[PDB]
Design a protein around this ligand. Structure first.
Ligand SMILES: O=c1ccn([C@@H]2O[C@H](COP(=O)(O)OP(=O)(O)OP(=O)(O)O)[C@@H](O)[C@H]2O)c(=O)[nH]1
Ligand SMILES: O=c1ccn([C@@H]2O[C@H](COP(=O)(O)OP(=O)(O)OP(=O)(O)O)[C@@H](O)[C@H]2O)c(=O)[nH]1
Ligand SMILES: [Mg+2]
Ligand SMILES: [Mg+2]
Ligand code: NA
Lengths: 171, 171
């Protein structure tokens, strides 16, 4: 098993390409109400999924809901790609604002693995260019995560490592 | 600052080339008796500095002393290069046996930084090829450290980051 320690009061930031299995992992490891996803927040703004005009407000709404949860001292997982520094930055600030530990959980899987899961998805899909870009972005992000303010940085380097994860909420 | 969390019961494994500032860092951040260096253990076997003829005995002594400390449940810092997996693995296994958390602190500094420091040393110096090799070995080591069994992996990527470090011991 790969034991990843997180404090009871954490902001768990999932980092990974579309198709890297963030939501699947989130559903396996955390309670449904602990998980705030970008899909969910966009859905509050529009029932039209491909509406790129609501993306900003959805980010704002994601940040706000997370802020209020952490404020209440409730462990929260951000289920969004988070492969751009600009997306991670406000989460870190939120975490530090409410004295939570920001934790990065990085799905450092090959692009091919994500591309294939994507094609095999029945719920919703993205175009292949999206995952190519995500994967490059995820990779460029790894080295700097600790410097960004993440107190614990856990890089999962393969499907088997992802599968073997057990969280220990010791602190 | 760069906050690194370590449990009260830790085996803190410093990982860095000769010249990367391990002992300097150890002296700044830890009590002298918490630090066990390969150089100290070698010195118990021989008067000659960096006596390469007693290396195996020196590391045996290091492992023994480290094991006895962890047995007493006392936080220990291993101040050796630890750039080889064969050097790290027994520390991980020692930690696991005494139910302690192994923590990796990696001095991921550019080679030239270490080379420069090396030449200004009054204590002892190594040849350039040694530091080249250590740095290569260190860099190769980084990705797999979590998988090796390190519970927390902290990579310090520049002197600035190294300087900024503050440890938080959660007891
Ligand atoms: O180990 C796994 C994990 C996930 N999957 C499969 O991968 C597909 C994508 O899995 P997810 O829907 O969990 O990916 P994601 O959250 O990272 O994707 P975005 O919302 O960012 O777009 C799903 O169909 C899932 O069943 C596997 O096949 N094996
Ligand atoms: O931030 C620093 C840290 C250290 N140094 C200087 O670099 C030199 C080496 O620093 P150390 O002697 O602490 O390196 P080390 O323990 O990693 O090396 P080995 O035992 O493995 O050989 C020392 O002379 C120190 O003063 C700096 O110039 N700046
Ligand atoms: Mg998802
Ligand atoms: Mg030293
Ligand atoms: Na999973």
């Amino acid at each position: 098993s790969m034991k990843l320690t997180i404090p009871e009061l954490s902001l768990v930031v999932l980092i990974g390409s579309s198709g890297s299995g963030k939501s699947t992992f989130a559903k396996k490891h955390f309670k449904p109400t602990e998980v705030i996803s970008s899909d969910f927040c966009r859905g509050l703004m529009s029932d039209d999924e491909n509406d790129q005009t609501v993306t900003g407000a959805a980010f704002d709404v994601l940040h706000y809901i997370v802020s209020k949860r952490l404020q209440l001292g409730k462990l929260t997982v951000v289920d969004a790609t988070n492969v751009q520094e600009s997306a991670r930055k406000p989460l870190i600030e939120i975490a530090k604002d409410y004295h939570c530990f920001p934790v990065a959980v990085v799905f450092n899987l090959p692009e091919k693995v994500c591309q294939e899961r994507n094609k095999n998805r029945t719920d919703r899909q993205v175009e292949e260019y999206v995952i190519r870009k995500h994967t490059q972005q995820m990779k460029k992000s790894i080295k700097g995560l600790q410097r960004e303010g993440f107190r614990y940085v856990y890089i999962l380097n393969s499907p088997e490592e992802v599968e073997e994860v057990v969280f220990e909420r010791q602190p």
